[PDB]
Amino acid sequence: LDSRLPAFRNLSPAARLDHIGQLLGLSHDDVSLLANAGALPMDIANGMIENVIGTFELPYAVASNFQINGRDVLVPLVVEEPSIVAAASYMAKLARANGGFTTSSSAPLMHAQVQIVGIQDPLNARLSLLRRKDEIIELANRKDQLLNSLGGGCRDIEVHTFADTPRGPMLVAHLIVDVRDAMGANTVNTMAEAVAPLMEAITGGQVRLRILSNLADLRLARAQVRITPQQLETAEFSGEAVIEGILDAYAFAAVDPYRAATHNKGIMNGIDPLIVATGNDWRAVEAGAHAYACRSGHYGSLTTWEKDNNGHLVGTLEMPMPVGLVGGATKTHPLAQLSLRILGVKTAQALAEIAVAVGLAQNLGAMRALATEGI
Amino acid sequence: LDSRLPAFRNLSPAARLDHIGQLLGLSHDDVSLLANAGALPMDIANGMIENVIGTFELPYAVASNFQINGRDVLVPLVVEEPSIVAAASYMAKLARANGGFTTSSSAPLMHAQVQIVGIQDPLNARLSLLRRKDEIIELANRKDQLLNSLGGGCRDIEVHTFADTPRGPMLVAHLIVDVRDAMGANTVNTMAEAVAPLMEAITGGQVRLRILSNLADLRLARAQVRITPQQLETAEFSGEAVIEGILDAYAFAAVDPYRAATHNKGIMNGIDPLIVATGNDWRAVEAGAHAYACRSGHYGSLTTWEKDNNGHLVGTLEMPMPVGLVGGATKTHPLAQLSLRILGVKTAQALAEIAVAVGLAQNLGAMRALATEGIQ
Ligand SMILES: CC(C)(COP(=O)(O)OP(=O)(O)OC[C@H]1O[C@@H](n2cnc3c(N)ncnc32)[C@H](O)[C@@H]1OP(=O)(O)O)[C@@H](O)C(=O)NCCC(=O)NCCS
Ligand SMILES: C[C@@](O)(CCO)CC(=O)[O-]
Numbered sequence: 186l187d188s189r190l191p192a193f194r195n196l197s198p199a200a201r202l203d204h205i206g207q208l209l210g211l212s213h214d215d216v217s218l219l220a221n222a223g224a225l226p227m228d229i230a231n232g233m234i235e236n237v238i239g240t241f242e243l244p245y246a247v248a249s250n251f252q253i254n255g256r257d258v259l260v261p262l263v264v265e266e267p268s269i270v271a272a273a274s275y276m277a278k279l280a281r282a283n284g285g286f287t288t289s290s291s292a293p294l295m296h297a298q299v300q301i302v303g304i305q306d307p308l309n310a311r312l313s314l315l316r317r318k319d320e321i322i323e324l325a326n327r328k329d330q331l332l333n334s335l336g337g338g339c340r341d342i343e344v345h346t347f348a349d350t351p352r353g354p355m356l357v358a359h360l361i362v363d364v365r366d367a368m369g370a371n372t373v374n375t376m377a378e379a380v381a382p383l384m385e386a387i388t389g390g391q392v393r394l395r396i397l398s399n400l401a402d403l404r405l406a407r408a409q410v411r412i413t414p415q416q417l418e419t420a421e422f423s424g425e426a427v428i429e430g431i432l433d434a435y436a437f438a439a440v441d442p443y444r445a446a447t448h449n450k451g452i453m454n455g456i457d458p459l460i461v462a463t464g465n466d467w468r469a470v471e472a473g474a475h476a477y478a479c480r481s482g483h484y485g486s487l488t489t490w491e492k493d494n495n496g497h498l499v500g501t502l503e504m505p506m507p508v509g510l511v512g513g514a515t516k517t518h519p520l521a522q523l524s525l526r527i528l529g530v531k532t533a534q535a536l537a538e539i540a541v542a543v544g545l546a547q548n549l550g551a552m553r554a555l556a557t558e559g560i
Numbered sequence: 561l562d563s564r565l566p567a568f569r570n571l572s573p574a575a576r577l578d579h580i581g582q583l584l585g586l587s588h589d590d591v592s593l594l595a596n597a598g599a600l601p602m603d604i605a606n607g608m609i610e611n612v613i614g615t616f617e618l619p620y621a622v623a624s625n626f627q628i629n630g631r632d633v634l635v636p637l638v639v640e641e642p643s644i645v646a647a648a649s650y651m652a653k654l655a656r657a658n659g660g661f662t663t664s665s666s667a668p669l670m671h672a673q674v675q676i677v678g679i680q681d682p683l684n685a686r687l688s689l690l691r692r693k694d695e696i697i698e699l700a701n702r703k704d705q706l707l708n709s710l711g712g713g714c715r716d717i718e719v720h721t722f723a724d725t726p727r728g729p730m731l732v733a734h735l736i737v738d739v740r741d742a743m744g745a746n747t748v749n750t751m752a753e754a755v756a757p758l759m760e761a762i763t764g765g766q767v768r769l770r771i772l773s774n775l776a777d778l779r780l781a782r783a784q785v786r787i788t789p790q791q792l793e794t795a796e797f798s799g800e801a802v803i804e805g806i807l808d809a810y811a812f813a814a815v816d817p818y819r820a821a822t823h824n825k826g827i828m829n830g831i832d833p834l835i836v837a838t839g840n841d842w843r844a845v846e847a848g849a850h851a852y853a854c855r856s857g858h859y860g861s862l863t864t865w866e867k868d869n870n871g872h873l874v875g876t877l878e879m880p881m882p883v884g885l886v887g888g889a890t891k892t893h894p895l896a897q898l899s900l901r902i903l904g905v906k907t908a909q910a911l912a913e914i915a916v917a918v919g920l921a922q923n924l925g926a927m928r929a930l931a932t933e934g935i936q
């Protein structure tokens with residue numbers, strides 16, 4: 186597959202669609218889903234949320250030049266803002282010359298929180314739970330036998346305590362669950378809620394909230410990119426000068442939350458559109474991203490930018506990225522299914538890796554422009 | 561306008577649409593935009609973003625029973641997740657019995673950052689800028705006569721310094737701009753560019769970036785709600801017990817970032833759909849919300865929940881809310897325009913106030929369920 190779409194930005198929507206169908210070998214029916222308005226039937230729409238009275242459209246585009254771990258990939262994006270798709274495509278083009286984007290990710294692990302509250306001895310109760318963790322882990326898994334046969338399931342449990350709160354001492358158990366190709370919400374909420382009774386028996390307290398945590402710091406995705414000075418040379422500045430300017434911009438975001446917020450927003454300009462295109466939950470992705478950005482106590486930059494021993498500009502992006510290939514709109518929306526088809530992803534983590542590659546490219550594009558704009 | 565919409569739940573989409581058109585007196589052309597697929601022409605879509613090859617649909621719904629400062633309002637929402645719209649509508653229903661939602665907001669003030677490097681004297685340069693602030697403020701305003709005549713314009717300037725960074729000392733100036741019924745991006749970025757030269761002359765340093773800040777903490781919107789124990793009573797728990805459970809949930813979110821993130825996510829489940837429906841930038845709203853949530857040095861809850869002297873559950877939501885009635889997709893998308901018509905908002909801040917009322921209702925709905933019989 187060749188993701189380099191020469192003059193793509195100049196072709197009409199119909200010609201672009203036609204092209205894409207050729208390169209990927211899409212069927213007639215497939216192409217029809219995009220060539221005609223209304224791919225989301227009302228009976229499906231009406232079943233997705235409540236009080237439905239119609240549908241709302243947003244442009245559906247494809248970013249070009251992406252390469253992940255040596256393989257070309259086409260990226261669908263749904264958003265209303267200008268310059269996003271173009272910036273992503275351009276930066277991806279420059280990345281190709283140096284190997285493209287290199288990515289990796291952890292197992293798809295999600296947290297399931299179980300809050301406990303009228304315990305006179307929360308600290309002691311915590312060791313009682315840890316003592317019987319295997320028992321708890323087995324109860325959570327037999328709950329769902331199919332997931333375990335697919336390679337997932339509850340892998341462990343952690344317990345934290347907050348003995349000093351205005352409502353008193355609280356004990357919070359975390360089930361660590363491998364959710365496979367799903368986002369994780371229902372799977373995880375379901376186990377938390379099967380284990381609640383046993384935890385009450387062990388601790389003697391009262392279980393309150395049983396719910397997942399959107400701060401998915403155990404489900405990380407990572408991307409790297411490299412750019413040389415020769416590729417950033419403008420008619421006004423040398424490539425070396427531009428790189429120095431980009432490093433200044435990064436340092437600025439690392440120390441000032443007012444810039445970091447804007448800096449990180451640019452990253453989500455690239456990621457959210459891919460989430461929407463695949464029918465995934467963008468509020469979940471946004472919460473995990475920004476909460477992770479301030480885990481140290483200071484709200485900073487999700488990406489990093491440096492200059493290697495060769496003077497080359499190198500950036501990274503590591504962040505929580507919970508997404509699914511199954512569940513909700515990802516399965517019921519005809520276009521969400523087509524997007525996955527166009528992407529060619531076989532696992533949820535593969536989609537997560539593409540997401541951060543796009544976020545990284547978007548961040549780079551924004552800084553390059555901000556740093557090259559004449560006064 | 562009566563926003564209760566009886567039986568809306570069981571109506572068909574066509575019947576719901578018809579009913580809405582009646583209440584608001586919408587024209588046939590307007591109803592046609594929703595009764596038919598393709599309200600967004602491809603010539604418009606193709607001009608919105610790059611490399612377009614078609615369009616992507618999401619359900620368009622209307623939340624019922626909302627009431628803002630004594631006036632009923634219908635709320636459009638575009639999202640893919642179930643139970644959002646129903647929860648919002650149900651909580652709005654309970655709020656009506658006690659006066660509905662009460663809201664307020666600050667002026668539409670946005671920050672425009674101007675970063676300066678290349679000077680060994682940042683802390684002196686900062687006073688040089690403050691000394692000539694009126695001059696700077698006048699230069700920024702002459703750049704937008706219309707905005708000022710409409711009641712907006714640069715109102716002041718702030719200057720901050722970061723004398724010690726891995727890249728050397730930095731000076732950062734903030735233009736404080738009233739942008740009225742606009743989100744603010746282009747308006748503020750333009751004034752920043754216009755003032756950059758003068759700032760360089762005054763400080764002797766080199767200007768780098770000139771860009772707005774998405775941490776819009778000077779453009780806040782606020783909402784309040786009140787619920788009585790009688791309204792929260794279930795077959796299993798007493799009203800008073802439920803309220804105590806909700807307070808436990810709030811305390812949990814206030815101390816543990818793992819819960820706060822999820823807690824705040826629920827708030828955005830209510831807000832983002834309204835942003836999409838009005839053609840606004842949802843990444844901007846999300847960034848301002850979460851960054852604001854950790855301004856104290858600890859990522860916490862955007863909302864607050866308490867019990868007043870009467871034992872009634874009272875909640876609040878104050879947060880940055882950048883939105884516009886003009887600019888971008890808000891003007892070019894036929895349905896974004898219809899949404900504003902349905903809402904009846906006359907200013908951007910009025911839309912911002914409705915947004916937080918919805919976010920507050922959503923948060924309440926999620927906690928009531930979690931604390932009571934379950935989320936599931
Ligand atoms: C949706 C929910 C209310 C349904 O169960 P319920 O409490 O048994 O429902 P009720 O029949 O008592 O609901 C009554 C009111 O809720 C609203 N409601 C409930 N189900 C609804 C639906 N399918 N469509 C529209 N409104 C609905 C109605 O507006 C109604 O008022 P009305 O007189 O104007 O018609 C409940 O599951 C809930 O609140 N869940 C919380 C989950 C959450 O926070 N979800 C967010 C997405 S995570
Ligand atoms: C330009 C930018 O604001 C993107 C626009 O939404 C991001 C950034 O400043 O890095």
Ligand SMILES: C[C@@](O)(CCO)CC(=O)[O-]
Nearest residue numbers: 396822823826926927935
């Ligand atoms: C139910 C909730 O998880 C929303 C799901 O999308 C929010 C919350 O926990 O408050």
